[PDB]
Design a binder for these strands. Structure first.
Lengths: 48, 185, 43, 37
RNA sequence: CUUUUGAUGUUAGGGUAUUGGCCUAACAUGGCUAUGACGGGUAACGGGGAAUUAGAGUUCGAUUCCGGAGAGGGAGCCUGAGAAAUAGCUACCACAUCUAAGGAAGGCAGCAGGCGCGUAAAUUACCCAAUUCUAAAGAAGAGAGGUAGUGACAAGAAAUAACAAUGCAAGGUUUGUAUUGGAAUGGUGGGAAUUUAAAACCUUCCCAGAGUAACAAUUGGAGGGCAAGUCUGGUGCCAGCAGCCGCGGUAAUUCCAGCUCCAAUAGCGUAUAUUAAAAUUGUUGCAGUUAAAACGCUCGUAGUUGAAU
RNA sequence: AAAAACCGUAAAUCCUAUCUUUUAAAGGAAGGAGAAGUCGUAACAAGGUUUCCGUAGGUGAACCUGCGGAAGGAUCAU
RNA sequence: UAUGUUCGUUA
RNA sequence: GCCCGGAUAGCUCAGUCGGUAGAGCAGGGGAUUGAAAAUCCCCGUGUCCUUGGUUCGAUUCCGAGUCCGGGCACCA
């Protein structure tokens, strides 16, 4: 379980071309910063 | 603290979940025995695997070994009680030859459909579910009740079934007609 | 800075209902109709 | 890594010169550590 | 490595319930170690056991039973047959309660329950009826224990229909197939027997109670692996999917939808870990010219192996 | 019975030392990842100086040169 | 046996 | 604390001894491409830092303030 810090669009690899929607999460268990992909089409808007 | 009573799994998932030649065989069997799910055939072949494993272990032991000439007839008499083996089958070599259809023919629904009572294996399944069937002084609503050679002779309709001597017909149906009749009369 | 189009096709896909149809058959009865259909008519 | 260094099947930097450059860099790093400690 | 600070042993004693460097005095220099001592790590209580096993194996075991240890951390001690006891005491350390400010009292890793922590775990319930223990021993107690509550942790059985007549199809008057239309039956509610410490559940019996049996099954997929669409719309390298290979720039079998179908089914996905797969840890049973891999070479101790009689 | 002393059991605090774990840091210097940077042309053909090894020096860079090796060579060969 | 460099990315 | 210098687009910089305000990059449309880079066309956007004066008129000439930066320094 973490706290969302920001939302970022991450570039895809070279053969593909997309902007994957990810969120920078600060974990509350230890405090580390991770990047979590947000599956779904409009799911980035579903997370503040 | 914890309960001491056991519990085990009676079925094993097949692995390789999309074998066409296995799925077709298993659907043929499911439909022709009228059983609800392939977990049921998995239970039956799990059982058969257990019997086959015991038998195969026994064949490795030499004849006139105490373990073999104890458990071999234990298993053999159990098998003849279940009826899977007949008089024409006598050795440990024939228990290895048992198959899924001959294991499924001992289910209650197949036995009752074969004996009559129901005109279809699905009718038999639903009838045992509606508890109209007796295996001798004892009524069973378990379709997968495996019948022994000393029970088919006393499978018949339950004494509380409307077809077994109980309340004859639909109460509302037998009441509405008589009320209309008294009103007309 | 081009995340403002998150979930665009979900929004612009036309919405259509699931209509009326008929209650689907389940259980052993479900396996009945899948089993019986593949030998009688075909041949 | 092992005895299969060089082996230029892949068109890379010549192993002898890559080794030379790494050695030069190690010499510089060792000198820096000697200066600090 | 151990050995002043007991390390190894001898002698004498002290101490103990008893043997013992357990401790003391004298004395000697011993004791362990590449067959890994001494250290470090363990997200390590050990075993009975668990998962996976063709056979070998690998991984797990806080947790029903046994043994150990602990009662916030240490230490000390009384009573007692038995305790270095903690719902016993004494003190310090850390927390923390009441106080009239002088002083008192504390220890849920018992049962519930609360906070916190976290991905992560139930009722501040009923009873001693059973099991068994303590007693001045039938009769009292027992959050031991049992009973119920919460409970998709797992496990087992098993509904969501079945049946008859015509249309339609196949075929030599046989099967599948929409209309009808009567039987059967639970789920549900009510009462009862019964159950129970009391109650509840189960089981059984009597009343109503099923046609869109609305008493309406879901989950995840349909390019390949891998079962199942070259169907219709939308988007148009975007949004998105995708474990991997890949799809997406106007015909998208792969995204977003509808229909259909497939799979397992009251269950079905996802994450992480672990087993098989993995003969990719190889004793069984791998590989080493060129894919990773024969020490530059020889001697050589330990180790391993060793002619016939 | 207070109280005291002495051997012992010894909590606890402090100082010092060592070790373990985590972590800040000017600056330095690697690696990896970027759809499309600059510079050259090192390797693969005899890659236009055969390639490669060890070692030493030198250079913007790939790299060049010396000594001794190898063929994995462009020679299985009067 | 004088010299003679380079070819953006994806499909 | 005096001695100098610049403030010009969205960012960065040039301006006859006053009269017009401009290039590059960011920026939309394009042209090219299967697509995209690169290249090439055109849009847009400013009291020329802020006040005051000189002038017919000032970004320019003055004067001051503001911010930021280049050279100051006293003896023994």
């Amino acid at each position: 379980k973490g706290i969302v810090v920001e939302k970022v669009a991450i570039e895809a690899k070279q053969p593909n071309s997309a902007y994957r929607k990810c969120v920078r999460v600060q974990l509350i268990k230890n405090g580390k910063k991770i990047t979590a992909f947000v599956p779904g089409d409009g799911c980035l808007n579903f997370i503040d | 603290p914890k309960s001491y009573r056991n519990y085990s799994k009676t079925a094993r998932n097949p692995k390789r979940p999309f074998e066409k030649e296995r799925l077709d065989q298993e659907l043929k069997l499911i439909g022709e025995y009228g059983l609800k799910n392939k977990r049921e055939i998995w239970r039956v072949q799990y059982l058969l695997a257990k019997i086959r494993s015991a038998a195969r272990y026994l064949l490795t032991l030499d004849e006139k070994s105490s373990k073999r000439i104890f458990q071999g007839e234990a298993l053999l008499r159990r098998m003849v009680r279940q009826g899977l083996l007949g008089e024409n089958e006598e050795k440990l070599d024939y228990v290895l030859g048992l198959t899924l259809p001959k294991l499924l023919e001992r289910r209650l629904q197949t036995k009752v459909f074969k004996l009559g009572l129901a005109k279809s294996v699905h009718h038999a399944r639903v009838l045992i579910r509606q508890r109209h069937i007796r295996v001798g002084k004892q009524m069973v609503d378990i379709p997968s009740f495996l019948v022994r050679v000393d029970s088919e002779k006393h499978i018949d309709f339950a004494t509380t079934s409307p077809f077994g001597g109980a309340r004859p017909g639909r109460v509302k149906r037998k009441s509405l007609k008589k009320q209309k009749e008294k009103t007309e009369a | 800075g081009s995340l403002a189009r998150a979930g665009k096709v979900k929004n612009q896909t036309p919405k259509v209902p699931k209509l009326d149809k008929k209650k689907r058959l389940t259980g052993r009865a479900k396996k009945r109709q899948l089993y019986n259909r593949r030998f009688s008519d075909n041949g | 890594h092992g005895a299969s260094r060089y082996k230029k099947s892949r068109a890379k930097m010549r192993w002898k010169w890559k080794k030379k450059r790494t050695r030069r860099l190690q010499k510089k790093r060792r000198k820096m550590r000697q200066r600090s400690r």
